Amino acid sequence: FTEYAGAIKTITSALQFGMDALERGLVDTVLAVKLRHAPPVFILKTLGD
């Protein structure tokens, strides 16, 4: 039983690994869209006036 129930703890923690590394994919790809649309200060300041 302690071999079974220690093997279901491995396969959950390998699969909590899958989803909780895919919530990092949101935060990365949302930030990557923002950095593609972020021109710097020195270009955009004189266009702001």
Binding site: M19, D20, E23, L26, V27, V30, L31, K34
Partner: protein
Amino acid sequence: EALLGVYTNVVEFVKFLETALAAACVNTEFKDLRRMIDGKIQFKISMPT
């Protein structure tokens, strides 16, 4: 000889919706995004003189 401590990290997940990065975005759940080909948003700007 003795075991004195058996220690282990736990990675706490950080949801995207509870980061403050999501203040700069508008989050909508969309069930079937694999069906979509192309999105489109159309603007109409009238300019008075």
